[PDB]
Design a protein around this nucleic acid. Structure first.
Length: 74
DNA sequence: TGGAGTACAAGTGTGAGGAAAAGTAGTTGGCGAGTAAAGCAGT
């Protein structure tokens, strides 16, 4: 395994990682307020029963290595 | 002005760890009554 991370779909996600910090930490424009971030993660960390979410709940089950895999108690 | 490198960032040389079903163990258990005669002992 060459440690260049030359996979194409792998590198799209880092572009989605570095953007979401830069567009929020350096915001002189005060268009993205802090209280909306306080209404994002509080509304995102919230379970629901759609079939995408139910199907996502199966995916947490199958992987045993990492934490946030014994998430079934909640 | 221009070099000692020392750093992170690129590389390639060196054997093994984890996966699993069928097949293979040591171990119990669960079988198939008469009426007659002659013989040689007997003494």
């Amino acid at each position: 395994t060459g440690r260049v991370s030359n996979h194409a779909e792998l590198r799209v996600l880092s572009y989605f990682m570095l953007t979401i910090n830069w567009m929020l930490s350096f915001d002189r424009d005060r268009q993205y307020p802090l209280k909306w971030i306080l209404s994002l993660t509080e509304s995102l960390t919230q379970r629901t029963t759609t079939s995408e979410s139910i199907g996502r709940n199966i995916v947490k089950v199958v992987y045993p290595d990492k934490p946030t895999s014994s998430d079934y108690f909640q």
